């Protein structure tokens, strides 16, 4: 069975019911000068029970669109 | 139109539209009667449910609606019962 | 386009004998025109590079575009000196092959025979003077054209042939048995200067 994309990130907003905003924080090399630059890609995840709190590390897996901007599902709470 | 077949398609599509919309309205009325029966709480609600299910499936035949469109109605209709 | 002008004035512009005999440089071994006999300023290095390049393409009677493209292909040869490999490809030109085998006294004559269709490659007629001849291919005169004074004079007139050529004076059929080595071609031509010319 094929697999979806799972990313590790940090909760930066839980002021919305059943949803969290996550930040993945990868690093990319500059196309010209080659230096590694910090890059933040943040996602909206459907929190089943508003479990994960702000400033928490959480794993999210991709899913079908759950709302206008939701595309991901909370999987694990790795750190509180 | 300019092409003869296009001229003929105007007539045939117009005729198809009249038939399609009449039969579709029939399906909507059949559904409408059943739903209104449920609101009133009638006695023959069973017959109207069957006719509502009959109308939707017959509409799926003739392809006035899609099979999935029919299935969603049938599930919805049954819930109302 | 072919150059059909006077031949001597080309050799004395280049300071070499394009026919390899010297009759062009015997009298008035200086450039053509009224300014020839008397003294002029030193040629620039660009002029030195220009004249060396013009030596070769005048030697084999080619226009500049064809000369450029052949020089480009000679670069693609991975092994060997760029300039040397270029000189070999000029020699393998069907024009030159006809003249080397002795079927014509001059390269213009060799080109005239190839162009007009008197020559056959591996028994098959080829009328392209630019045609590139592999080692071992047989170059012959057309069966209708074997009895023309011009080739027969050339066949008997030429008393020497390059070591890299096989020839049969009866069949009028010859072939290069291997590539020419640099020393076998014109030593007076400095191919290094040509390479640097097109390098600019």
């Amino acid at each position: 069975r094929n697999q979806r994309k799972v990313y590790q990130g940090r909760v930066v907003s839980d002021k919305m019911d059943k949803t969290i905003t996550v930040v993945v924080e990868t690093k990319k090399n500059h196309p010209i000068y080659g230096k590694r630059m910090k890059y933040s890609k943040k996602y909206k995840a459907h929190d089943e029970n508003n479990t994960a709190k702000v400033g928490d590390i959480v794993k999210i897996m991709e899913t079908r669109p759950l709302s206008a901007t939701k595309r991901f599902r909370l999987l694990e709470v790795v750190e509180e | 139109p300019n092409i003869e077949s296009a001229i003929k398609r105007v007539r045939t599509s117009a005729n198809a539209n009249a038939k399609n919309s009449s039969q579709t309205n029939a399906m909507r009325t059949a559904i409408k009667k059943f739903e209104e029966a449920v609101a009133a709480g009638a006695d023959n609600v069973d017959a109207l449910y069957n006719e509502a299910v009959k109308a939707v499936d017959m509409a799926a035949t003739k392809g006035l609606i899609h099979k999935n469109k029919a299935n969603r109605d049938k599930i919805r209709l049954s819930k109302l019962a | 386009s072919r150059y059909t002008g006077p031949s001597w004035k080309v050799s004395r512009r280049l300071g070499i004998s394009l026919s390899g005999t010297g009759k062009e440089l015997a009298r008035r071994p200086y450039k053509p025109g009224q300014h020839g006999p008397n003294s002029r300023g030193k040629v620039s290095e660009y002029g030195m590079q220009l004249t060396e390049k013009q030596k070769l393409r005048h030697m084999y009677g080619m226009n500049e575009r064809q000369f450029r493209t052949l020089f480009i292909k000679a670069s693609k040869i991975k092994e060997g000196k760029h300039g040397v490999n270029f000189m070999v490809l000029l020699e393998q030109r069907l024009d030159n092959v006809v003249y080397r085998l002795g079927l014509a006294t001059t390269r213009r004559q060799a080109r005239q025979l190839v162009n007009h269709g008197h020559i056959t490659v591996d028994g098959k007629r080829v009328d392209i003077p630019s045609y590139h001849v592999e080692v071992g291919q047989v170059i012959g005169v057309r069966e209708k054209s074997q009895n023309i004074s011009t080739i027969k004079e050339a066949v008997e007139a030429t008393v020497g042939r390059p070591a890299f050529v096989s020839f049969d004076t009866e069949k009028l059929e010859g072939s290069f048995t291997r590539l020419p080595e640099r020393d076998e071609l014109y030593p007076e031509i400095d191919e290094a200067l040509v390479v640097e010319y097109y390098n600019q």
Partner: protein, 134 residues
Amino acid sequence: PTINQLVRKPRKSKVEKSDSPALNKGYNSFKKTQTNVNSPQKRGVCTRVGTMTPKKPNSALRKYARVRLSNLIEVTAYIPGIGHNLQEHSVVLLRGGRVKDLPGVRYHIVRGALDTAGVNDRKQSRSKYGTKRP
């Protein structure tokens, strides 16, 4: 600069500009706007034909034409060669090219094109000056 600076503010190069800007702009009659179309030449009408003076080292009576182009731009152009048949309201074809003597002249008039005649008596470099082989 450090690498981080170049990441923050990358290198940026000077933008070049045309020597002959009036040839870079077309005109759309409908929208009444100027299009950016690179054209090797442009037709115009001579609003004024006369003579001009050079800058300090040189002295002559250089021949120009004040040409209003088909793109509505107003340009000063030079009439090369000896003698010309241009007059005001003539249709002339302009090519690029400054004239170092004349400060405001950035275009030359093409000889032998449109109303411009070839140069009389010319015998060398005829393709310039637009004269047929004698």
